Write an enzyme that holds these catalytic residues in place. Structure first.
Site, PDB file in Angstrom:
ATOM      1  N   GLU A  92      -1.478  -7.427  16.475  1.00 33.30           N
ATOM      2  CA  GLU A  92      -0.081  -7.651  16.882  1.00 33.30           C
ATOM      3  C   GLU A  92       0.751  -8.003  15.636  1.00 33.30           C
ATOM      4  O   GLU A  92       1.141  -9.157  15.429  1.00 33.30           O
ATOM      5  CB  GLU A  92       0.033  -8.746  17.950  1.00 33.30           C
ATOM      6  CG  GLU A  92      -0.370  -8.301  19.351  1.00 33.30           C
ATOM      7  CD  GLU A  92      -0.102  -9.346  20.421  1.00 33.30           C
ATOM      8  OE1 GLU A  92       0.920 -10.059  20.327  1.00 33.30           O
ATOM      9  OE2 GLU A  92      -0.910  -9.442  21.371  1.00 33.30           O
ATOM     10  N   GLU A 108      -5.375 -13.964  22.793  1.00 33.31           N
ATOM     11  CA  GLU A 108      -4.846 -15.255  22.359  1.00 33.31           C
ATOM     12  C   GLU A 108      -5.443 -16.457  23.100  1.00 33.31           C
ATOM     13  O   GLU A 108      -4.723 -17.166  23.799  1.00 33.31           O
ATOM     14  CB  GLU A 108      -3.316 -15.261  22.481  1.00 33.31           C
ATOM     15  CG  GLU A 108      -2.625 -14.327  21.499  1.00 33.31           C
ATOM     16  CD  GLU A 108      -1.111 -14.481  21.482  1.00 33.31           C
ATOM     17  OE1 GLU A 108      -0.539 -15.075  22.418  1.00 33.31           O
ATOM     18  OE2 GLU A 108      -0.482 -13.998  20.521  1.00 33.31           O
TER      19      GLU A 108
END
Ligand SMILES: *[C@@H]1O[C@H](CO)[C@@H](O[C@@H]2O[C@H](CO)[C@@H](O[C@@H]3O[C@H](CO[C@H]4O[C@H](CO)[C@@H](O)[C@H](O)[C@@H]4O)[C@@H](O)[C@H](O[C@H]4O[C@H](CO)[C@@H](O)[C@H](O)[C@@H]4O)[C@@H]3O)[C@H](O)[C@H]2NC(C)=O)[C@H](O)[C@H]1NC(C)=O
Ligand SMILES: *[C@@H]1O[C@H](CO)[C@@H](O[C@@H]2O[C@H](CO)[C@@H](O)[C@H](O)[C@H]2NC(C)=O)[C@H](O)[C@H]1NC(C)=O
Ligand SMILES: *[C@@H]1O[C@H](CO)[C@@H](O)[C@H](O)[C@H]1NC(C)=O
Ligand SMILES: [Cl-]
Length: 595
Positions: free
Chosen positions: A257, A140
């Site tokens: 995810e 991220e």
């Protein structure tokens, strides 16, 4: 009006890839006994049902120009021992060394680090094994989680080029992707969109060439409690990539995810039991049936990972987004840790029985055809025989799920009509059923009064709910047909497994291990790689002191906690497979154990 589910076994439409065989976690530990048991449970899912563990901060397990790889060696050996691969995020500062990826010297050093580690584990495990690893960028990058490392837009591109050239220097066969973020509408997610531009049209930091390798594009999109919302979001981003970056039209997309709800540690009752399990299956069915099953758009969707390898903590052993439920038992001498298998982990074992071809299936109610964007749906597979050690198989997995909502009051009438089963020897079927009433360890925990430090007996009772309710193998009716009318609860899962008889019996159970838990209590874990068939009733375990059969209710999960009343566990253990026709496979090599 009941739900009608038809399955045509004679219609193998297209390949069915097991694209969901991934989990992951973030350390707060990775070599602790807690984690060793955790990965034993994850690796115990049958038939490689979980293959990858996507792990953050792997390069904080390296210290620092030379590097000490000791702690990284330990973790990767741990995964290897459990037949698991690392989702290898190139993420960390090598214990404080790296601080700035616009510093030219640091960019060259990162390249050499990546080359060293890649070559090291090529040497340690072999190139054939390491070439399977999904190397990935820092997690991220647009969520600014870099600790003391300066990562600007330009720095991230320099970092990426070092990652890519470092891996290439080890071997061109190694795979690299990223960015592993959410790709929100610009001006948001600048590092994510910037990476794709850089790879598509930018210049390589080291070689000066136009364009840079990008083997896959990873995103994160979570459902905010909606299953179908995950898929909807992925389609938007995938289409944007296709039109904005034409060279990436066939580039595999990962959602590594892909969880129902953000925030793994937030306690949720539905995460405790079959509600979560059934939703996970539903999300997977939606992806197969509404994205991959010959859709007009046909996006190259390749991997989905539920990020649920975290260890739970007090006072929420079952309520967190985890495959296992952890109990730290502090009043024993010494304190010890136990794990329970949560239904979501058991559900990965039912999914793992799906084979390489998808069969035609239709769900309907009162004449109205319903796709997987509904509370009831199905995934159905067929298997082409490989050799004498296997035969034709069909696996029909039916879910009843209203996402994060359970409905204890309701009952779902379902009529399954299986047709077109090809003729063959000793054709039998076996049903495996999960719901919150019969097979929820959380529910048993709560019936026992929610003991904080469970006793040996209380653990036995909780573990008795881990496995699905399995019915003994029954011969398939004539004409290759089967009509069943189960009363499914909401949530629930039903796997109907129809198997032809292979010529040879099952193969040898391998890599048996004994792991201590506490006095008179131990984990037995093994591999199923050489068993050669999925049509298994149970695994027979035998124990010798001078061999007698350890009596247990049927289970195909490759992990068993042995906890006898006597407490006598010292001796030797051996395990073997038993198929639907009562044929035994050879015993594993005996494993000794002294307490
Ligand atoms: C038996 O013995 C074991 C081992 O000693 C004890 O284990 C400890 O259990 C507690 C929970 O009761 C753990 O503490 C909790 O850790 C959570 C995660 O911490 C990490 O992440 C956070 C946030 O990202 C970081 O701040 C932190 O530094 C860690 O990196 C926290 O989320 C918890 O805090 C939350 O709840 C508390 C309530 O207690 C609030 O006050 C806080 O504001 C916050 O909301 C909490 O700190 C601890 O980590 C465990 N230690 C170990 C070594 O495992 C068992 O508790 C004990 N059993 C019993 C029944 O007593
Ligand atoms: C899945 O089904 C839901 C409905 O259950 C769809 O959401 C509806 O979409 C239409 C667009 O034609 C809207 O007009 C409605 O307001 C929506 N209804 C609800 C209750 O949200 C959704 O589009 C479907 N998704 C897919 C991918 O098929
Ligand atoms: C590397 O680190 C390990 C673990 O901290 C330590 O035991 C060892 O001393 C170190 N090895 C070398 C060669 O410095
Ligand atoms: Cl979730």
């Amino acid at each position: 009006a009941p739900h009608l589910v038809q399955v045509d076994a004679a219609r193998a439409l297209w390949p069915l890839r097991r694209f969901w065989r991934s989990t992951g976690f973030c350390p707060p530990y990775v070599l602790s006994w807690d984690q060793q048991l955790n990965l034993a449970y994850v690796g115990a899912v049958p038939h490689r049902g979980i293959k990858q563990v996507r792990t953050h901060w792997l390069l904080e397990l390296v210290t620092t120009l030379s590097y000490n790889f000791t702690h990284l060696d330990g973790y990767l050996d741990l995964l290897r021992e459990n037949q698991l691969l690392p989702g290898f995020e190139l993420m960390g500062s090598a214990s404080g060394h790296f601080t700035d990826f616009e510093d030219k010297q640091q960019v060259f050093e990162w390249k050499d680090l990546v080359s060293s580690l890649a070559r090291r584990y090529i040497g340690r495990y072999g190139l054939a094994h390491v070439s399977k690893w999904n190397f990935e960028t820092w997690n991220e990058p647009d969520h600014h989680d870099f600790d003391n490392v300066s990562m600007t837009m330009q720095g991230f591109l320099n970092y990426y080029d070092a990652c890519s050239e470092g891996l290439r220097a080890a071997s061109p066969a190694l795979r690299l992707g990223g960015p592993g973020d959410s790709f929100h509408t610009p001006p948001r997610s600048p590092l994510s969109w910037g990476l794709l531009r850089h790879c598509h049209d930018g210049t390589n930091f080291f070689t000066g060439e136009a364009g840079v390798r990008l083997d896959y594009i990873s995103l994160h999109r979570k459902g905010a409690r909606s299953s179908i919302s995950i898929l909807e979001q992925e389609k938007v981003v995938a289409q944007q990539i296709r039109q904005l970056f034409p060279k990436f039209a066939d580039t595999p997309i990962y959602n590594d995810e892909a969880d129902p709800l953000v925030g793994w540690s937030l306690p949720q009752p539905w995460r405790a039991d079959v509600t979560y399990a059934a939703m996970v299956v539903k999300v997977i069915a939606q992806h197969q049936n509404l994205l991959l099953a010959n859709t007009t758009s046909a996006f190259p969707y390749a991997l989905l990972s539920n990020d649920n390898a975290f260890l739970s903590y007090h006072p929420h052993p079952f309520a967190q987004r985890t495959l296992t439920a952890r109990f730290q038992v502090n009043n024993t001498r010494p304190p010890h840790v136990q794990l329970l298998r949560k239904p979501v982990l058991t559900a990965m074992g039912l999914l793992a029985l799906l084979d390489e071809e998808q069969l035609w299936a239709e769900v309907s109610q009162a004449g109205t055809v319903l796709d997987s964007n509904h509370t009831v749906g199905v995934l159905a597979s067929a298997h082409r025989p490989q050799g004498p050690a296997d035969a034709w198989r069909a696996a029909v997995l039916i879910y009843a799920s209203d996402d994060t909502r359970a409905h204890p009051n309701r009952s779902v009438a379902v009529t399954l009509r299986l047709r077109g089963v090809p003729p063959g020897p000793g054709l039998v079927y076996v049903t495996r059923y999960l719901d919150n009433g019969l097979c929820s360890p959380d529910g048993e925990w709560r019936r026992l009064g929610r003991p904080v430090f469970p006793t040996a007996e209380q653990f036995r009772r909780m573990r008795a709910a881990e496995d699905p309710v399995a019915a003994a193998p029954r011969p398939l009716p004539a004409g290759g047909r089967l009509t069943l009318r189960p009363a499914l609860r909401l949530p629930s899962l039903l796997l109907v497994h129809v198997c032809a008889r292979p010529e040879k019996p099952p193969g040898q159970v391998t890599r048996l291990r004994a792991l201590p838990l506490t006095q008179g209590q131990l984990v037995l874990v093994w591999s199923d790689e050489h068993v050669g068939s999925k049509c298994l009733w149970t695994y027979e375990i035998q124990f010798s002191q001078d061999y007698t059969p350890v009596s247990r209710k049927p289970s195909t999960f490759n992990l068993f906690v042995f906890s006898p009343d006597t407490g006598a566990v010292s001796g030797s253990y051996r395990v073997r497979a038993l198929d639907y026709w009562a044929r035994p496979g050879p015993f594993s090599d005996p494993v000794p154990y002294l307490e």
